[PDB]
Every structure is written in C-alpha cells, then in structure tokens.
Design a binder for these strands. Structure first.
Ligand code: XG4
Ligand code: MG
Ligand code: MG
Length: 430
DNA sequence: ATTATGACGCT
DNA sequence: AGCGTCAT
C-alpha cells in the first residue's frame, strides 16, 4: 500500500541515433540522402558485411549482418558506403568523432552515460524540477511535444499515424494534474519536453536525427525508445507498464535477450515480462540467483534502480581484426605484422585520447582466437602499458601470446589465429 | 566468412 | 587475473 515503492523517483531518457553510420555518410555525401543505403565493411567477400541500414532500405528487408551481395538481391538500387580501411583493417574514426559531436551537445542539458557509439542515457530528474519551477503551474501545450508518443494511448472512444499520435497525446495532456509538482506523470511529461529540445539541438547542430525514450529508469527508457522509430520519442509511464508488459516477449528487455532470458522462459514456462509478477522474489532468486532474482522481481513491475553513471567517454580503447577461414595467420611473421598494424592504430587513438581527455591507459589486454574455437576469445593475457609506442605494444603482445604457438618450428604458427584484439584499459588522470 | 567493438558479471 | 555474457 502506502509503503510499496513504485520506482517513480527519477526521470531517465535514452537517446539513440537513427541508422547512425548511415546518417554520418549521408551528411558527408548528399547523393545518399533519402535513399535506400547501407554501410559495409570490406568488399571482396560477398560485397562486404552490412553494419547499418537506412529506413528506406529496411523496407526492402535489408538488415545488419547481411552480405552486400545478398542485400542487393532484395534491393537492387541499394546504395553503399564503405567504412574506411587503414593498415589493412576497418577504421571507425569518422563515426567515433561524429559520436563526440552528439554526446557533447547532449551533455549541455544533463549528465549522460555513454552506453554505445550512438546511444546515451540522460538523467533528467534535476532539469525537470528546474523547468517545473519555471512553469509556475502552467499547463503543457501539445505544441511542445511535436514528435512524442504516449505509450498505451489513445484508448477508449483516427486513420493516419500522426492523427493517432496526436489523439493519444491529447488524452494524456487532458488527464495531467499540473497542480502537483511531485506528480510522476507530470515529471515524465516535462522530461519529454526537454528531450524534444535536446533532439532539436542535435539535429540543428549536427544534421543527425535520433529517437528517444522517456521513463523512470534506464530499462524502460531503452524499451520506450524502440517503440516509435525513426525520428520520434516515446513516453512510457509507470501506469502503462502492466498492459505493455502483458504481451512483451521477455527477450525484448535489455539483458534478457540471451541465455538468461531463455532460462527464464524454459524454467518458468512463461513468455511475457508481465507473467513474472506471479512469482515471489525468493522464487526468482532460487532460479536465477540473488541479484538476477531481485532485479527480475522489481523489473517486471516497472522498477529498476541502476543509476545513470556520469561517464561520457569510453572506458577502454580497443582494436580487433578477424582472420576467417583460409586467411588465418599461420606464420610468426604474419602474427607479428598484424599485431603491429593493430598496435599502430591503437597508438594513434591513445595519443589523441591523452591530448583530448587528460588520461593515460595503464594496462594492455591481448586477446586471441585460434582455429576451431567457437568462443569469442580463446585466450586473454594482460601486460603493463607504460609507453604509447606501437612497436613496444606489439612486441609485448607477442611476448604474452607466443606460448600458444604449438608448432615446434620457429617460423610457423599453429594452430593458426582467427582473431587478434588489443585493448587499452585502466585509465589514470594525466 | 559477420565484424568490430564495448560494458560488465563471476570466480 | 582470466573467462563468460550481452549487445549490435
Ligand atoms: N563495427 C560494427 N559496428 C556496428 C555493428 N553493429 C552496429 N554497428 C554500428 C553501426 C550503427 O550505425 C551503430 C549504432 O548501432 P545501432 O544503434 O544498433 N544501429 P543503428 O543506429 O544503425 O540503427 P537504429 O536506427 O535501429 O538505432 O553501430 C557491428 O556489428 N560492428
Ligand atoms: Mg542507433
Ligand atoms: Mg544504439
């Protein structure tokens, strides 16, 4: 009753750039704008692998992970942009720099947590309180929410999508109690006003469009963001959770799309997030552990406590390359040469990071995959990173991995390597 | 022959 | 420390 916490204490948004790498290439090359187009890495094998797809191309069935030649079967007029190649590998610098453009704009409004190259959580609680004091009990006009959907509305007592959006928004705004400065629904609404402003600033100052979710925690904000894409934002209220979760497959919630979510489905014999409410917290803990069980018990009621961490910059800087099938590295000279290529890219990125961000990495992690292993990493070894020098980093990476070589011969490498991965970690202020 | 990352949990 | 999970 009155002591049951409802998880309505914060206003959290999740901003995700629409088809990011595509938008970056479309800004640079206007010929690609408003066209079916995709971004690929490499070219020789089946036209390259697609990693980003414009919404026009998605309409033809083009997806991430698809080979470009196969996508062209679905969409013969598909336009392609390729990721830059440097030192024999994909170089994603253009997209990292575009990411910084967007994250620096978002940081003007609130503290953000960089979740990926194109997404960030925003903790809007304090900004909402400030705006509410400015409003002085003034109602919120639908004009302030021109791209907002209210999940679950309209309901009750109409043909086109924009008319649906506006009907639901008007139902929502009509029911708002703007008298109460601590009303969670009001707070979410003001949060959505601020996110309209943030998204407008991003588009004005970069050209990039994005979608967003606004709710009371990170998981609901992330889920909300996906409900109306592209170039729209969605508000998920605490009250909308029972209906939303009643038909929501468990795998759609962040962290449940893998083995744990499958085990929830299999062990409990359920399909939808809402069905989890019928288990006690101890029952869920008995199946999935203390932490997961408590998290599931609260999350299926719309409640989650994970904070938006104050972190705009990535925690690691890494370089990796796969060597599939017949291109696997089978000689010592080969392994050394590719370690050097990776190390030279890493040195470039690390030196720029030190100048930009007043920090230095202190640990180098070396990960490899060997032929036949189905895992992502076959072996992971760390050493000290004491100087931003590519020849030194590559020699040290070789030194920590050289004992994996089964070959009695000094020149040969067996079993050949299907992936090399260098990662700079454990940053310190400088 | 999906690739290139990045965050984080467990022991 | 080194390995596994989730994501995309
Ligand atoms: N190198 C690499 N980059 C990837 C991969 N997957 C995604 N990216 C890059 C390319 C993506 O542009 C970017 C952001 O990833 P999303 O938010 O998951 N997809 P997007 O923003 O394209 O579409 P949406 O409108 O549905 O959000 O990350 C990958 O496997 N490898
Ligand atoms: Mg995106
Ligand atoms: Mg994203």
């Amino acid at each position: 009753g009155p002591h049951m916490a409802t998880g309505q204490d914060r206003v959290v948004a999740l901003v995700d750039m629409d088809c990011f790498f595509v938008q970056v290439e479309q800004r640079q090359n206007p010929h690609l704008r408003n066209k079916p187009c995709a971004v690929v890495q490499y070219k020789s094998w089946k036209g390259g692998g697609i990693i980003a797809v414009s919404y026009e191309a998605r309409a033809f069935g083009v997806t991430r992970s698809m080979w470009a030649d196969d996508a062209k079967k679905l969409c013969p007029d598909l336009l392609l942009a390729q990721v830059r190649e440097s030192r024999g590998k994909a170089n994603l610098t253009k997209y990292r720099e575009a990411s910084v453009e967007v994250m620096e704009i978002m940081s003007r409004f609130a503290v953000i947590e960089r979740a990926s190259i194109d997404e960030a959580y925003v903790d809007l609680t304090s900004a909402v309180q400030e705006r509410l004091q400015k409003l002085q009990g003034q109602p919120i006009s639908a004009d302030l929410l021109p791209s907002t959907y209210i999940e679950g509305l309209p309901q009750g007592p109409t043909v086109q999508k924009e008319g649906m959006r506006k009907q639901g928004l008007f139902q929502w705004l009509d029911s708002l109690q703007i008298d109460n400065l601590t009303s969670p629904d009001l707070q979410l609404t003001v949060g959505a006003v601020i996110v309209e402003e943030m998204r407008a600033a991003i588009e004005r100052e970069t050209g990039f469009q994005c979608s967003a979710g606004i709710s009371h925690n990170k998981v609901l904000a992330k889920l909300a963001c996906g409900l109306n894409k592209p170039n729209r934002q969605t508000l998920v209220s605490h009250g909308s959770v029972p209906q939303l979760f009643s038909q929501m497959p468990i795998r759609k919630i962040r962290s449940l799309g893998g083995k744990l979510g499958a085990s929830v489905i299999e062990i409990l014999g359920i399909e939808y997030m809402g069905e989890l409410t019928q288990f006690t917290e101890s029952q869920l803990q008995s199946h999935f552990g203390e932490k997961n069980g408590s998290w599931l018990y609260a999350m299926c009621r719309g409640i989650e406590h994970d904070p938006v961490k104050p972190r705009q910059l990535p925690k690691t800087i890494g370089c990796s390359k796969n060597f599939p099938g017949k291109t696997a590295l089978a000689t010592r000279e080969q392994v050394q040469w590719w370690l050097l290529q990776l190390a030279q890219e890493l040195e470039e990125r690390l030196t720029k990071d030190r100048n930009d961000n007043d920090r230095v990495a202190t640990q180098l992690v070396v990960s490899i995959r060997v032929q036949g292993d189905k895992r992502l990493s076959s072996l992971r070894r760390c050493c000290a990173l004491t100087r931003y020098d590519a020849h030194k980093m590559s020699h040290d990476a070789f030194t920590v991995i050289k004992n994996c070589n089964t070959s009695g011969i000094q020149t040969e490498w067996s079993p050949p390597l299907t992936m090399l991965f260098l990662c700079a970690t454990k940053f310190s202020a400088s």
